C-alpha cells in the first residue's frame, strides 16, 4: 500500500487536496487523478508514502436523509439528533454556533475540526487556526464505491464525508457535526454510531462561506483520538 497525499493552493491559498491508499499497480492511476484534481493551481504537493501498518474496517453506518425549510429547523433538527447520541442539547447547540459564525477565531474556516469536550462545550484543540485534520483513510476500492453510491443519488463529496466521517467514529469520535464551507453547497450531516450518518439540508443559506467540523469527544480520551484522526492508517470496505 502507498499512502497519495496533494494539496495545492492559488495565490497563497488552498483551493483543493485529496489523499487515496492503494497498492503499487494503482500509484500511477491514483496520482493521475490528484495531479487532476485542481482547476487552477499556483503550487501543488504530493507526497508518496508507503504503508507501514494498516487496518481495513467494514463500513456500517445507516444513511438517511432529511429535508427541511431553513437553516433553522434543520440546524435544530441536527441538535436533536446529537442529543440521541448523548450530547446534552446545549453542547450541541454550542458546535453550531461556532461553526456558523466562523470557526476560526481570528476569521473565516478552518481546515481541519473543532475537538469539542462532550461534557463541556470547551475546544480542546490547541490550533483554532488550523484545527485537527483527520487524513490517511480512504475506501478500499473507490472505483466500486463511487459509482454505487452515486447511482443511490449521493454526490461526491458525500463519497468523501462517509469515509472521512466514518474514519472518525472508529477512533473514537462519539458524533460529528459537518457542513460545506462551499457558499453553494448546504447539505451537510450529523453523524453517530447510533444515529448513523444523518444528511440534513438547508444546514446553511446558499452564498454563506462559512462551514466546517465538530468533533464530539471525551477528553478522558482526547491524546488517543488525535493520535488516531492524523496517524493509523484505515482502508474501509463496503
Known amino acids: 500500500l502507498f499512502s497519495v497525499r496533494m494539496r495545492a493552493q492559488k495565490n497563497g491559498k488552498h483551493v483543493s487536496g485529496a489523499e487515496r491508499i492503494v497498492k503499487k499497480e494503482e ?3 491514483a496520482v493521475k ?3 487532476n484534481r485542481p482547476k487552477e493551481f499556483d503550487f501543488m504537493n504530493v507526497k508518496v508514502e508507503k504503508v507501514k501498518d494498516f487496518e481495513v474496517v467494514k463500513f456500517n453506518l445507516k444513511i438517511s436523509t432529511y429535508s427541511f425549510k431553513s437553516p433553522e429547523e434543520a440546524r435544530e433538527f441536527a441538535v436533536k439528533k446529537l442529543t440521541q447520541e448523548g450530547i446534552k442539547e446545549e453542547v450541541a ?10 470557526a476560526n477565531p481570528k476569521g473565516g474556516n478552518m481546515r481541519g475540526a473543532v475537538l469539542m469536550d462532550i461534557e463541556t462545550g470547551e475546544r480542546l484543540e490547541e490550533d483554532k487556526e488550523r484545527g485537527v485534520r483527520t487524513i490517511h483513510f480512504d475506501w478500499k476500492d473507490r472505483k466500486k464505491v463511487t459509482e454505487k453510491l452515486l447511482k443511490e443519488g449521493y454526490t461526491l463529496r458525500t463519497v468523501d464525508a462517509l469515509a472521512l466521517t466514518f474514519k472518525n467514529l472508529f477512533c473514537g469520535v ?3 457535526l459537518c457542513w460545506s464551507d462551499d457558499p453553494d453547497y ?3 450531516y450529523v453523524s453517530g454510531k447510533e444515529i448513523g450518518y444523518v444528511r440534513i439540508t438547508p444546514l446553511k443559506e446558499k452564498g454563506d462561506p462559512l462551514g466546517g467540523r465538530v468533533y464530539f469527544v471525551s477528553r478522558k480520551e482526547l491524546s ?5 484522526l492524523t496517524q493509523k ?3 474501509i470496505e463496503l
Not at 447547540?93 to 456558523?100: C, G, H, P, Q
Not at 488517543?224 to 488516531?228: N, Q, S
Request: hydrophobic letters at 50%; a negative charge; glycine letters at 6%.
Open 174 to 176: 462519539v458524533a460529528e
Open 33 to 35: 487523478e490528484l495531479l
Open 224 to 228: 488517543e483520538i488525535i493520535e488516531c
Open 27 to 29: 500509484l500511477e492511476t
Open 186 to 188: 448546504v447539505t451537510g
Open 233 to 235: 492508517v484505515v482502508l
Open 93 to 102: 447547540k454550542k458546535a453550531v454556533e461556532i461553526l456558523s459564525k466562523g
